[PDB]
Amino acid sequence: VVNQNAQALNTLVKQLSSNFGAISSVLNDILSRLDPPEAEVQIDRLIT
Amino acid sequence: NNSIAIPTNFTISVTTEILPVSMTKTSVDCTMYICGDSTECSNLLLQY
Ligand SMILES: *[C@@H]1O[C@H](CO)[C@@H](O)[C@H](O)[C@H]1NC(C)=O
């Protein structure tokens, strides 16, 4: 159970590295390098 | 307050209790299931 909880936390924080189809996993760079009406679409895709 | 009913005989009954102990061990592979024999859907999946 201790390992299962640890693995669940590890996968959850590894899912932040996932892009989910967005141009990049990092939120700050895509927010900085994209204009509002397409950055919001990418941010929404990452949020979903 | 002074009367008791006592059985002068007995019946040996048999009762059937059915309990499920297991289910079919079904395995589904994601890469084959959602992305059929195509690489590009697998590349899109890797973003997830
Ligand atoms: C008890 O019941 C059984 C049937 O279940 C019967 O054959 C038997 O004769 C009975 N015995 C008495 C003492 O009534």
Side-chain angles (χ1 to χ4, degrees), chain A residues 15 18-20, chain B residues 44 46-48:
Chain A
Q15 290 281 177
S18 271
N19 310 331
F20 303 109
Chain B
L44 281 182
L46 291 151
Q47 323 297 327
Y48 288 68

Side-chain angles (χ1 to χ4, degrees), chain A residues 5 7-8 10-12 17 19 24 29 31 34 41 46:
Chain A
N5 288 117
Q7 190 188 193
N10 269 347
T11 205
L12 183 67
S17 292
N19 310 331
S24 166
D29 71 335
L31 182 73
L34 275 205
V41 180
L46 258 185

